[PDB]
Amino acid sequence: NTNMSVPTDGAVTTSQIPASEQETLVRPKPLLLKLLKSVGAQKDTYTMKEVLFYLGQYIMTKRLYDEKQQHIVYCSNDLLGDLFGVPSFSVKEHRKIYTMIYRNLVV
């Protein structure tokens, strides 16, 4: 008996195989590299998670986002927003985030 109703989290692959692709390291530009390496990036190749990590440092440390709404990043007059293809951006739009970064990498 087990009254502890817990999900059996394990590598159980009967019908499906986990949808997991090798996290593609993205290709940067000098502009990205300057922001990355200036916020503590040791890498020259980095995955999407690492973009979130390092690119987020840049937005934070420069305080390019709004004062009242953290989910609203202006970064206007900077290269960041520009390069994303935007005047400002919302971190709520995941798809936009991917594409704004993807705009700057080669695949």
Partner: peptide, 16 residues
């Protein structure tokens, strides 16, 4: 969603 910190929602927006 309230006022979720830029620190988290940005760094946690990746698929998996």
């Amino acid at each position: 969603d309230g006022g979720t910190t830029f620190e988290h929602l940005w760094s946690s927006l990746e698929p998996d």
